[PDB]
Design a protein around this ligand. Structure first.
Ligand SMILES: CP(=O)(O)OC1CCCCC1
Ligand SMILES: CP(=O)(O)OC1CCCCC1
Ligand SMILES: [Co+2]
Ligand SMILES: [Co+2]
Ligand SMILES: [Co+2]
Lengths: 327, 322
């Protein structure tokens, strides 16, 4: 009984192969409840999620960390239903993403701390499901509110031992400002993952954060718009860098002695409403493997390039276990 | 069985004294469900709402129209519970307010029309409760998205007969631009209420819209401040806001007037403890219209039959699906 999942507490050894940054549904607070027909039906979304997670389990995945926050449309009852049906452990998140409502954005650092602590210690909504990770975000220079969220996340982490994971605009080196704010609150770098770090080729930025003890989130490996770059909306979110380029950053960080600081994921989803219509159809064509992309296509790629089996197992099993474990 | 309420359909006769622009709780989508301790507890908010609605009922109110939209934190199950315990009919709303999320603000006019139609024709969430009004908003010159919302609201109204009610920045005269968009869509002015119209003293703006067939929403009479409270309430007294009703009755537009309090029992979409400030400014709550505004208008010479026309007849005709 170490890490909290949507099905209850599980031991560290039960976690196994873990994908540290995933989503079942990328939405907005209350959206799925009010407009399930946007995703066909709630039933259709569940079935797609169950099929995808089952295919991921068949490939080796045993646990995923759903980093969807309140404002990213997190529906823990959906997470619970799909987790049980697919028999894959799902770790839920607290925190705030890039779209907080008025009721969240007018809150003080003390109130935000209480909200995060409530979702970790008491439970999310009336479900009794407790969060096992805190998700925060910046998109360039932090706004006065985003600073309060980072500080509240740090205080929530210090009181519970629960890790913090971030969304960054990696090209703008956001991880450095986030790191500075986290450390001013006394939070240990070993409890933080600087996410979306594969969105940049700046190895100097990645190694420096890794040297300080930060976990590096190389979480969007299948995101590439190569071939279909005519669609401005798809190119803006996927990027023009290949999956191989993003995957070679895993090799680059190992080669420099930071294998213990790497966390790999797909940043996949089965539903996506917080972007243009039919983006889900575009995503499923680019990567038909879904969450199964890491064990099926990335792990054999790194094995072909010379990376040993034990360090890859250490990246996919040992690093997430050490990160998610409350300390 | 024509007007949809949170407890099912009711007739025109059952509506009675109706407050056309009210809120049980002003929040954000999913907020009350995720953080009920912010309001003390869900039980505390329900109890405050029931006592508040019972006070309005004892003062003569039979129906209130909760204009809280999806993004304004509307929880129809809460509206259903408080309606039951207080024996006051509550009409739920669809539409979008000033805080739409990414999943709403990236939608086309066709998709927003489908959403509004869903809430009116099928039901809200999984409750089976259908909306009886469409709420929309502009805060000055309409943003490209706000134009899309106004058009989708008109299309949803034209397909159902359900009325449209608006939130305006009355000092910037949004009602004229809202009117132009509604008319371009083919929406009849008699199906539209230009709300927050009592935030301005410009009578020429109100009478011109009323002459075109629009309903004028003089809905924030208790909102007066005579830090962050002064920015939302304003430096104008309730008597000045109430005299605008008489000024419109005199200009011959008693049939175009809709009066309300724009009150709430929970408010999370603003600064903390804003409720303690509001409850001291107006301890009458939703009962402010029949207890303070109606006797004030009676004192100024306005007959009981035109006041009964404004509070009973006008809302029934407005809410009736046509
Ligand atoms: C900008 P980010 O990729 O973290 O958010 C998205 C939410 C919907 C699923 C894909 C991810
Ligand atoms: C500016 P608006 O009329 O939406 O103010 C409302 C006050 C009551 C809570 C919901 C907001
Ligand atoms: Co993500
Ligand atoms: Co308003
Ligand atoms: Co209002």
């Amino acid at each position: 009984d170490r890490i909290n999942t949507v099905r209850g507490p599980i031991t560290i050894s039960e976690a196994g192969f873990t994908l540290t940054h995933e989503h079942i549904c990328g939405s907005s607070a209350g959206f799925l409840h009010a407009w399930p027909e946007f995703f066909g039906s709630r039933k259709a979304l569940v079935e797609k999620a169950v099929r995808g997670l089952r295919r991921a389990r068949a490939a080796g995945v045993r646990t995923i960390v759903d980093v969807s926050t309140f404002d990213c449309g997190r529906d823990v009852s959906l997470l619970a239903e799909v987790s049980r049906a697919a028999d894959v452990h799902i770790v839920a998140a607290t925190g705030l993403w890039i779209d907080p409502p008025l009721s969240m954005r007018l809150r003080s650092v003390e109130e935000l701390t209480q909200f995060f602590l409530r979702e970790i210690q008491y439970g999310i909504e009336d479900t009794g499901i407790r969060a096992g990770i805190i998700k925060v975000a910046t998109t360039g220079k932090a706004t006065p509110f985003q600073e309060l969220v980072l500080r509240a996340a740090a205080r929530a982490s210090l009181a519970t031992g629960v890790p913090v994971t971030t969304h960054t605009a990696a090209s703008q080196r956001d991880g450095e400002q986030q790191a500075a704010i986290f450390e001013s609150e006394g939070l240990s770098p070993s409890r933080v993952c600087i996410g979306h770090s594969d969105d940049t080729d700046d190895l100097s930025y990645l190694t420096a954060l890794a040297a300080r003890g930060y976990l590096i989130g190389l979480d969007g490996i299948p995101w590439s718009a190569i071939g279909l770059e005519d669609n401005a909306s798809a190119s803006a979110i996927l990027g023009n860098r290949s999956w191989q380029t993003r995957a070679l950053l895993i090799k680059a960080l190992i080669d420099q002695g930071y294998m213990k600081q790497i966390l790999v994921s797909n940043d996949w989803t089965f539903g996506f409403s917080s972007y243009v219509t039919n983006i889900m159809d575009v995503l499923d064509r680019v990567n038909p493997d879904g969450m199964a992309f890491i064990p099926l296509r990335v792990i054999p790629f790194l094995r072909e390039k010379g990376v040993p089996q034990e360090t890859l197992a250490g990246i996919t099993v040992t690093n997430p276990a050490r990160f998610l474990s409350p300390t």
